[PDB]
Write a protein that binds this ligand. Structure first.
Ligand SMILES: *[C@@H]1O[C@H](CO)[C@@H](O[C@@H]2O[C@H](CO)[C@@H](O[C@@H]3O[C@H](CO)[C@@H](O)[C@H](O[C@H]4O[C@H](CO)[C@@H](O)[C@H](O)[C@@H]4O[C@@H]4O[C@H](CO)[C@@H](O)[C@H](O)[C@@H]4O)[C@@H]3O)[C@H](O)[C@H]2NC(C)=O)[C@H](O)[C@H]1NC(C)=O
Ligand SMILES: *[C@@H]1O[C@H](CO)[C@@H](O[C@@H]2O[C@H](CO)[C@@H](O[C@@H]3O[C@H](CO[C@H]4O[C@H](CO)[C@@H](O)[C@H](O)[C@@H]4O)[C@@H](O)[C@H](O[C@@H]4O[C@H](CO)[C@@H](O)[C@H](O)[C@@H]4O)[C@@H]3O)[C@H](O)[C@H]2NC(C)=O)[C@H](O)[C@H]1NC(C)=O
Lengths: 669, 668
C-alpha cells in the first residue's frame, strides 16, 4: 500500500543517474561511469554550459585555492565551508540542462568532500526546475551515521570486520539477525542506556529518524543563505513561513511533553547556567560530538564575545518593539501592519531576504548560528576546516538536543510579542453567513509502536571486490517508531445558501499542568494544524467525512532506495517521495497516548473559499488562500469575540495500545 | 638492542601458554586450545584444584548469580564489578598449581567479560609465586583502545572493513602504509581540540604510552584492595611507597611543565569551578568518554553527596594534624614516628592495609574513587554494570587528564603537611666520616623524538577464517620522547675503605620566575635517577656510571611478535621480566631546548649498611633500611646539605632535531 505514480524511460534513466550518487557515498567505484566522467571533466572548457559566467569563474578561483578536503565533517554553519558549498551549489544550479548538471555532479563526487557534495547535490535536485518531480532518498538512508547511536554503529562495524557472525545465537542476543542476505540490527533509543534528566522520556520523539529527517528537508527546500526570489509569491511571506514552521513544530513537541508529564519548555538566560544537558551518543569518523553537562554556564570566557552578540541581537529587537514604527535594514517597518511578519521572521533567521540579496555574506553574523555554537558547548574550532561537532551543527541532528527546542521557543516567543501589535479578528471576519457546525464526531484515536527498518549501508566500507559485484546494500536497522491507527472525522454542517468553503482541522491541549481548561487568550499558539481542504456546501444539512490518511499536511514513510530501483523497473515512483518530500511523517501525527486516554481538543473551522486571489503554489502547495498561515490562530484571540456558529471545539482522547515502551520491542527471546 | 635472559624449555612452554590468552582478546577462536580446555573444564567438580575452599565457594555463589556480561566496560572503581574481579583473582591466586591456573584462566577467558579477565589475569601472573618470573605484554598491546586516539582507531577499522588499501597513494596521504604485509598507521598527539588549553603543550608526555603503562603496572603490582602481607616486612612501609610513587611522578611532571613554560600545578576546590578541561578521544562502543569543559562547576546537584564525603575525609586528616596524637582504625598513632608515614599513606589510599584486612570490603568508601568520579565529569551510572566512562575510570588512561595531577598534587601536599611533624636530618646523620666528593662530570644530555611501533591488533575484529591463524599486523607508529645515553663520573677522596651507596637525583634549578630554588622549597621536586652500592678505596678514585644502567628506568617493551621470536631462541627481555614496573628510559629526561635547559644533578654518597634479604613488590624497594627518597623524604634545613659527601651540579638538558612531534608525521 504505497501511493504510486507512472513514468517514462527517459525519467527512469535520469532518476537512476540521480540515485547513483547516493550509493556507497564515502567511496569511489573507479569502474562506474560516474568515475570516468568525473575524473576527466574539464570545467573551464565547459564554461558555455552554464547560465552564469561568473559563478563558474568564482568557483574555479575557489577550487584553485583548494576546497575542504575529503573525509572531514562538513557543516554549513562555518564560514569557509558554507561559501564552498554555495559556490558548488551555483555550479549545479546554473548547469544548462541535465547532461551538464550530471557531468558536473560526477566531478564533484569524485573530487570534493562527501558531506559538502551531498549537501549541495541534495539542494540542487530540489531547486533545479528540471528536477521537480524527481525523487531523492531519505536523509537517514543518505547519512545513517547521523540517525543512530554508537551502539548500533559498532555492532555494524564489528559484523563487517568479521565478515559475518562467529556465532548466530550470540548475535541474536545482541539484536543482530541475518534475514536473506541482509544483516538486521535492532536499535533502542538512547534512554534505554542513558537517563540523565527527564527529557529522556521523549527520545522516541526527538530521536525519531522521521522527525529529524523532516527538519533537514525543511532546510533544503529553502536555505537561510539563499534568497527566495525563485518562489515568487512566497518572497513577501518568507518570515511568516519561518515563524509558522517553528510555532507548529513546537506545539507538536509540547504535546509530547504533556503526555509524558513534563509541562512547558523551560526559558533560559545567556547570563545563567542552563539546566538540562545533552550527552550525544553519536560518532564522527574523526571525533566525538560535544557534550553539555547539566548546569552548563553559558557565560564563560570562551563565550564572552558570542554572548555580547546574542544579547544585542535580542535587544535591538526589544527596541523595535518599544519603537512600534522605525526604519531598519533600509525599510520602514510598521508593527500594526500584519505584513511586518515578513521582516520579523527574516530578522530572526538572518536570511538573505533580510538584506534583499541573492546569498548571505560572511559579515552578516547570524543569531541562530551563534546561539547554536554557544549552546553546542563545543571547544573553539581548531581551524577553518576542523571543528568539534555538536548535534546543533547539523540539520539532521538538531532535534535531538533539548536546547534546540529552548532556542526556538525563545525566538518564537519574541515573535509572539510582536504579534501583540496585531488587532485581533472581529466577529465579522470570522462569521460564515448562514453556516453552522452542529456536530463533530471522531473515530477512536490510538497510538502504538511498530518496527521500522532502513538501509544503513552508507555507514559501512566495502572492499574493492564487493564494490565491483555491487553487494553494497546489506545493512538494515530495525527500530520501533510511533504510529497510529487511521481515524475519521465527521463534520455535520447546516447552510441555507450553497457555496464553496474551506475546512480546517487543528489539534490542541485541553488542560495545563494544574488541569485548568485552556483559555484561547493564552493558548492560541499551542494549536497544531492537522488538515486543510475545500468542499461544496448545499442548502440544508451536509455530512463531511475526512480520513486521517487524506490529511494534506502529512506524508507516508519513504521507501528504501533499493525498492525505488525495483519500482523504476516497472516505471513507477512512490508519490509521497516526489511532491510530498518535506511534510511531517503521518505516523508522528499524534502524540503518544496514554492507556486511559489523554485529553486533547480538536478545533474545526469552516469559512468561505471566495475566489483564490492569491494562493501558494511555489515552495508549498499550502495556503491556496489570501489567509495568513495558521488562519485563524495566527494572532492573539479574544475568547468572547472569537467563537461563532461555524466553529466547533470537540473534546478528544488519545489512547495507546500494546507496549508503552519502545525498548520492550528489542528484547531478545 | 635489548638485554636478554637465557631461559630453559619448561619455561618457554609455560610462557607461551600464558601469552596465548592475550591474543584476539575480543573474540573467541573455536579452534584454539584455550577454548577446548575451557569447555572440558568442569568448574563444579573441581574444588580440589584450589588451596582456599572459601574462595572457591565464594566464586561459585557469584557465578550462579551472574557476572558482568561480555563486551561492557570494566572498571575496578565500581563496587559490584570490583567484587567480581576480586573473586576471580582469588580463584587464580589460590590455584593449587600451574595446570589448574591455566584451566581456570581458559575458562574465564571464554565465559567472562574480557576486560575483567585481563585485569584479574594480569594481576594473578604478577602475584602468583610460581609465575613471579614470567613476562607480560605491554598494556598498550593488550588494551589498545586505551592508548589509541579515535582518529587512528577509525583509520584501522575502515582498513579492516575494506580488506586493505584500495589505493596505496590515498592511503599514504592519510598516514597508512604497507610494510612486510603489515599495516602501519602514523599517529599524532591530540590537538587543542582534546586539551582546549595550555595543557596541550604537554600532550607528548601525558598521552605517551610508556607513561600510561607505567601507572597500570604500578597498580597491578599492589592493588589498593589487597593486603600486602605477601611481601612481609614491606607491609610496614606501604604508605611510604604510596607517597614516594606520586611525589616522584609529580616531580617528573613538573619538570616537563617548566621546560614548556607552564609553572605550578594548579590547586583546586570542591566548591569552585575547575579551570582546566579535558576532552578524551575514547569511546566504549556504547558511550563516548565523558568530557569536562573548561571552568566546570564541581559542586552541582549530582555531586552534593560525594563532595560532602570528600570534604570530611580531608577535614578528618586536618584534625589528625591538629591533635598530634589520636586513636584511628584500632591504632594509637603518634605523628612523630614512622608507623605514621605508613599510616598516612594508607589513609589516603583507603587500601586494605588501613583496615588490617585481606581485601577491601563492599562498604569502605574510597577518597580516590570519589575524587575521580567527581573530577571525571560523567553522568551517574545507568545500573550496576553500566557506567559512562572517563579517563579517570582506568589506570591505563588516568595520566591523560590534567585533573589527575591536580588530584594527586592535593594528596601529596597533605602528606607534606604531615611531614612537618618529622624531625629533620642533622649534620651527623648525613656526614660520611672520611669521605668527600671533589667533582662530578656529565656527558651531554640530549633529548629528541623518534618513532616507536606497537601492535594494535587487539581492537580489530577478524573473521572465523582469519582467527584460525591468530592474526596481528595492525601497527601504530608514534613519535615519542627519548634521550641519548650519557655517563656520570664522580670523583671521590676518602680516608678508609667500605661499601658506599651512591644516589643521584634530578631537580629544577630555577622556578618559572628565573629565580634559584632553595632546598627548603625544593626537596619535594627532586626525582631519583639511580641507586647503587660501591666498594670505596682509600685515596682518590672515580666512579663512572652510565644512564643505560640507572636502577629506576627500563628499556622499551618488545611486542609479542618479538617476544615469540626470542622465546624461539631460549631468550626473554630482562626488563620486561626483572623490572616491568619501572619508568621507561626514554622518559628519563624532560624535553630540553636547543639552547639547553638548566637543572641540577644531586649526587649523594653515604655508608652502606648490609640489610634486608627480601622479595620485592617494586624495584623502588632497594635493599636499604633508609626511607624511600632519602635524604629527600622530608623537610630539609638547607645548612646541612653542605657535607663534603654531597655535590649539586648544574646541568643543561639539550634537544635535537624537530621540537614538535607532529613534524614527524607529515606525508610527502
Ligand atoms: C534495548 O533495551 C532493553 C532494555 O535495556 C534491553 O533489554 C534487556 O535485554 C537483556 C538481554 O540482552 C535482558 O537480560 C536477560 O534477562 C533474561 C531474563 O531474566 C536472562 O535470561 C538473561 O540472562 C542470561 O545472560 C546473562 C549475561 O548475559 C547470564 O549471566 C545468564 O547466565 C543468562 O544466560 C542464560 O542462563 C543460564 C544460566 O543458568 C545459562 O546456562 C543459559 O545458557 C542462558 O544463556 C539476560 O539477563 C534484560 O533483562 C533486558 N532488560 C529489560 C529491562 O527487560 C534490550 O536488549 C536492548 N536491545 C538492543 C537490541 O540493544
Ligand atoms: C599530523 O599533524 C601534522 C600537522 O598538523 C599534519 O601535517 C599536515 O598535513 C597536511 C596534509 O597531510 C599538510 O598539507 C598538505 O600540505 C601540503 C603542503 O602545502 C604547503 O605549500 C602550500 C603552497 O604550495 C602552502 O599553501 C601551504 O601552507 C604549505 O606550506 C600541500 O601540498 C597539500 O595540498 C592539498 O592537498 C589536499 C589533499 O587532501 C587538497 O585537499 C588540497 O586541495 C591541496 O591540494 C596539503 O594541504 C599540512 O601542511 C601539514 N600541517 C603542518 C602544520 O605542517 C600530518 O598530516 C598529521 N599526520 C598524521 C599521520 O596524522
Amino acid at each position: 500500500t504505497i501511493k504510486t505514480k507512472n513514468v517514462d524511460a527517459v525519467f527512469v534513466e535520469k532518476q537512476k543517474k540521480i540515485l547513483s550518487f547516493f550509493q556507497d557515498v564515502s567511496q569511489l567505484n573507479t569502474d562506474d561511469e560516474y568515475y570516468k566522467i568525473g575524473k576527466d571533466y574539464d570545467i573551464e572548457m565547459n564554461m558555455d554550459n552554464y547560465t552564469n559566467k561568473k559563478a563558474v569563474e568564482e568557483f574555479l578561483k575557489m577550487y584553485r585555492t583548494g576546497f575542504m578536503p575529503k573525509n572531514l565533517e562538513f557543516s554549513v554553519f562555518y564560514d569557509k565551508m558554507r561559501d564552498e558549498a554555495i559556490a558548488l551549489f551555483h555550479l549545479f544550479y546554473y548547469a544548462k540542462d541535465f547532461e551538464t548538471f550530471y557531468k558536473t555532479a560526477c566531478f564533484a563526487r569524485v573530487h570534493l568532500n562527501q558531506g559538502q557534495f551531498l549537501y549541495a547535490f541534495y539542494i540542487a535536485v530540489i531547486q533545479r526546475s528540471d528536477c521537480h518531480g524527481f525523487v531523492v532518498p531519505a536523509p537517514y538512508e543518505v547519512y545513517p551515521k547521523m540517525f543512530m547511536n554508537m551502539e548500533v554503529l559498532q555492532k555494524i562495524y564489528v559484523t563487517k570486520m568479521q565478515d559475518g557472525l562467529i556465532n548466530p545465537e550470540a548475535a541474536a542476543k545482541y539484536g543482530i539477525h541475518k534475514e536473506n542476505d541482509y544483516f538486521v540490527y535492532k536499535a533502542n533509543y538512547s534512554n534505554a542506556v542513558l537517563y540523565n534528566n527527564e527529557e529522556q522520556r521523549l527520545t522516541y520523539f526527538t530521536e525519531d529518524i522521521g522527525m529529524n529527517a523532516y527538519y533537514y528537508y525543511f532546510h533544503s527546500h529553502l536555505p537561510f543563505w539563499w534568497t527566495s526570489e525563485k518562489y515568487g509569491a512566497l518572497k513577501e511571506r518568507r518570515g511568516e513561513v519561518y515563524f509558522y514552521f517553528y510555532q507548529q513544530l513546537l506545539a507538536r513537541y509540547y504535546f509530547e511533553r504533556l503526555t509524558n508529564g513534563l509541562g512547558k519548555i523551560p526559558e533560559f538566560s545567556w547570563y545563567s547556567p542552563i539546566k538540562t544537558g545533552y550527552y550525544p551518543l553519536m560518532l564522527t569518523k574523526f571525533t566525538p560530538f560535544a557534550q553539555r553537562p547539566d548546569y552548563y554556564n553559558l557565560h564563560t570566557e570562551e563565550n564572552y564575545e558570542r554572548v555580547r552578540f546574542l544579547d544585542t541581537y535580542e535587544k535591538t529587537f526589544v527596541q523595535f518593539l518599544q519603537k512600534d514604527h522605525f526604519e531598519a535594514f533600509g525599510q520602514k517597518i510598521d508593527f500594526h501592519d500584519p505584513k511586518a511578519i515578513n521582516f520579523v521572521g527574516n530578522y530572526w533567521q538572518d536570511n538573505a531576504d533580510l538584506y534583499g540579496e541573492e546569498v548571505t555574506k560572511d559579515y552578516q553574523r547570524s543569531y541562530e548560528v551563534f546561539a547554536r555554537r554557544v549552546l553546542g558547548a563545543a571547544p573553539m574550532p581548531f581551524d577553518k576546516y576542523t571543528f568539534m561537532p555538536s548535534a546543533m551543527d547539523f540539520y539532521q541532528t538538531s532535534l535531538r538536543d533539548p536546547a534546540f527546542y529552548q532556542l526556538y521557543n525563545r525566538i518564537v516567543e519574541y515573535i509572539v510579542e510582536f504579534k501583540q501589535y496585531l488587532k485581533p479578528y472581529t466577529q465579522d471576519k470570522l462569521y460564515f453567513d448562514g453556516v453552522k457546525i452542529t456536530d463533530v464526531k471522531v473515530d477512536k484515536l490510538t497510538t502504538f509502536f511498530e518496527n521500522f527498518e532502513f538501509d544503513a549501508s552508507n555507514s559501512v566500507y566495502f572492499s574493492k571486490e564487493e564494490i565491483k559485484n555491487n553487494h553494497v546494500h546489506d545493512v538494515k536497522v530495525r527500530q520501533p517508531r510511533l504510529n497510529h491507527s487511521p481515524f475519521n472525522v465527521n463534520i455535520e454542517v447546516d447552510s441555507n445558501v450553497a457555496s464553496d468553503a474551506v475546512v480546517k482541522i487543528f489539534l490542541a491541549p485541553k488542560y495545563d499542568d494544574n488541569g485548568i481548561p485552556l483559555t484561547l487568550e493564552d493558548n492560541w499558539m499551542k494549536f497544531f494544524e492537522l488538515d486543510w481542504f475545500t468542499t461544496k456546501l448545499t442548502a440544508g444539512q451536509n455530512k463531511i467525512i475526512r480520513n486521517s490518511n487524506e490529511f494534506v499536511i502529512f506524508k507516508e514513510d519513504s521507501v528504501p532506495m533499493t525498492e525505488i530501483m525495483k519500482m523504476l523497473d516497472e516505471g513507477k515512483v512512490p508519490f509521497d517521495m516526489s511532491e510530498e518530500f518535506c511534510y511531517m511523517p503521518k505516523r508522528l501525527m499524534l502524540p503518544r497516548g496514554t492507556e486511559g486516554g489523554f485529553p486533547f481538543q480538536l478545533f474545526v473551522f469552516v469559512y468561505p473559499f471566495d475566489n483564490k486571489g492569491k494562493d501558494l503554489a511555489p515552495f508549498e502547495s499550502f495556503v491556496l488562500d489570501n489567509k495568513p498561515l495558521g488562519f485563524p490562530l495566527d494572532r492573539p484571540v479574544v475568547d468572547a469575540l472569537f467563537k461563532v456558529p461555524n466553529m466547533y471545539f470537540k473534546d478528544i482522547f488519545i489512547y495507546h495500545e500494546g507496549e508503552r515502551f519502545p525498548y520492550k520491542f528489542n528484547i531478545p527471546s | 638492542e635489548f638485554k636478554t635472559t637465557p631461559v630453559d624449555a619448561a619455561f618457554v612452554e609455560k610462557q607461551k601458554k600464558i601469552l596465548s590468552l592475550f591474543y584476539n582478546v575480543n573474540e573467541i577462536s573455536y579452534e584454539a586450545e584455550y577454548y577446548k580446555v575451557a569447555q572440558d573444564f568442569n568448574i563444579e567438580a573441581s574444588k580440589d584444584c584450589y588451596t582456599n575452599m572459601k574462595a572457591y565457594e565464594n566464586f561459585m555463589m557469584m557465578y550462579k548469580v551472574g557476572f558482568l556480561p561480555k563486551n561492557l566496560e570494566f572498571s575496578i572503581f565500581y563496587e559490584k564489578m570490583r567484587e567480581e574481579a576480586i573473586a576471580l583473582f582469588k580463584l587464580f591466586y589460590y590455584a593449587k598449581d600451574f595446570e589448574c591456573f591455566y584451566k581456570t584462566a581458559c575458562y574465564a577467558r571464554v565465559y567472562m567479560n574480557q576486560g575483567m579477565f585481563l585485569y584479574a589475569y594480569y594481576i594473578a601472573i604478577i602475584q602468583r609465586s610460581d609465575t613471579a618470573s614470567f613476562v607480560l605484554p605491554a598494556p598498550y598491546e593488550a588494551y589498545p583502545q586505551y592508548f589509541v586516539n579515535m582518529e587512528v582507531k577509525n583509520k584501522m577499522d575502515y582498513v579492516k572493513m575494506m580488506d586493505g588499501c584500495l589505493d596505496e597513494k590515498i592511503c599514504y596521504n592519510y598516514g597508512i602504509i604497507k610494510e612486510n604485509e603489515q599495516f602501519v598507521m602514523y599517529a599524532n598527539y591530540s590537538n587543542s581540540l582534546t586539551y582546549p588549553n595550555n595543557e596541550d603543550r604537554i600532550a607528548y608526555l601525558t598521552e605517551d604510552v610508556g607513561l600510561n603503562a607505567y601507572y597500570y603496572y604500578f597498580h597491578s603490582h599492589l592493588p589498593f584492595w589487597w593486603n600486602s602481607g605477601k611481601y612481609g616486612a614491606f607491609k610496614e612501609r606501604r604508605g611510604e611507597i604510596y607517597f614516594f610513587f606520586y611525589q616522584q611522578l609529580l616531580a617528573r611532571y613538573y619538570m616537563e611543565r617548566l621546560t614548556n613554560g607552564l609553572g605550578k600545578i594548579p590547586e583546586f576546590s570542591w566548591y569552585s569551578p575547575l579551570r582546566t578541561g579535558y576532552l578524551p578521544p575514547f569511546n566504549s562502543f556504547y558511550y563516548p568518554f565523558a568530557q569536562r569543559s573548561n571552568d566546570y562547576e564541581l559542586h552541582t546537584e549530582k555531586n552534593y553527596e560525594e563532595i560532602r564525603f570528600l570534604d570530611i575525609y580531608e577535614k578528618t586528616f586536618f584534625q589528625y594534624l591538629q591533635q598530634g596524637h589520636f586513636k584511628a582504625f584500632d591504632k594509637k598513632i603518634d605523628l612523630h614516628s614512622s608507623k605514621a608515614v605508613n599510616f598516612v599513606g594508607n589513609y589516603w589510599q583507603t587500601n586494605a592495609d588501613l583496615f588490617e584486612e585481606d581485601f577491601l570490603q563492599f562498604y569502605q568508601r574510597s577518597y580516590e574513587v570519589n575524587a575521580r568520579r567527581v573530577l571525571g565529569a560523567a553522568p551517574k551510572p545507568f545500573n550496576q554494570y553500566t557506567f559512562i566512562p572517563s579517563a579517570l575510570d582506568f589506570y591505563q588512561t588516568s595520566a591523560r587528564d590534567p585533573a589527575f595531577y591536580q588530584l594527586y598534587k592535593r594528596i601529596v601536599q597533605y602528606i607534606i603537611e604531615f611531614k612537618q611533624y618529622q624531625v629533620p636530618y642533622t649534620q651527623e646523620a648525613l656526614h660520611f666520616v672520611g669521605l668527600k666528593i671533589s667533582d662530578v662530570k656529565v656527558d651531554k644530555m640530549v633529548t629528541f623524538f623518534d618513532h616507536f611501533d606497537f601492535d594494535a591488533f587487539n581492537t580489530v575484529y577478524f573473521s572465523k577464517e582469519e582467527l584460525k591463524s591468530s592474526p596481528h599486523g595492525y601497527k601504530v607508529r608514534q613519535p615519542r620522547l627519548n634521550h641519548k645515553p650519557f655517563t656520570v663520573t664522580i670523583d671521590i677522596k676518602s680516608d678508609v675503605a667500605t661499601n658506599a651507596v651512591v644516589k643521584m637525583f634530578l631537580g629544577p634549578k630555577y622556578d618559572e620566575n628565573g629565580f634559584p630554588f632553595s632546598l627548603e622549597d625544593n626537596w619535594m621536586n627532586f626525582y631519583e635517577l639511580d641507586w647503587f652500592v660501591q666498594k670505596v678505596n682509600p685515596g682518590q678514585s672515580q666512579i663512572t656510571r652510565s644512564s643505560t644502567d640507572f636502577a629506576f628506568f627500563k628499556e622499551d617493551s618488545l611486542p609479542m611478535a618479538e617476544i615469540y621470536k626470542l622465546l624461539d631462541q631460549g631468550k626473554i627481555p630482562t626488563d620486561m621480566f626483572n623490572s616491568s614496573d619501572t619508568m621507561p628510559s626514554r622518559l628519563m629526561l624532560p624535553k630540553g631546548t636547543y639552547d639547553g635547559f638548566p637543572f641540577q644533578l644531586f649526587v649523594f654518597v653515604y655508608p652502606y649498611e648490609p640489610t634486608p634479604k627480601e622479595s620485592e613488590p617494586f624495584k623502588a624497594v632497594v635493599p636499604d633500611n633508609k626511607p624511600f627518597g632519602y635524604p629527600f623524604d622530608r623537610p630539609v634545613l638547607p645548612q646541612y646539605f653542605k657535607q663534603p659527601n654531597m655535590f649539586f651540579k648544574k646541568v643543561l638538558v639539550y634537544h635535537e632535531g624537530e621540537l614538535f612531534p607532529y613534524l614527524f608525521n607529515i606525508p610527502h
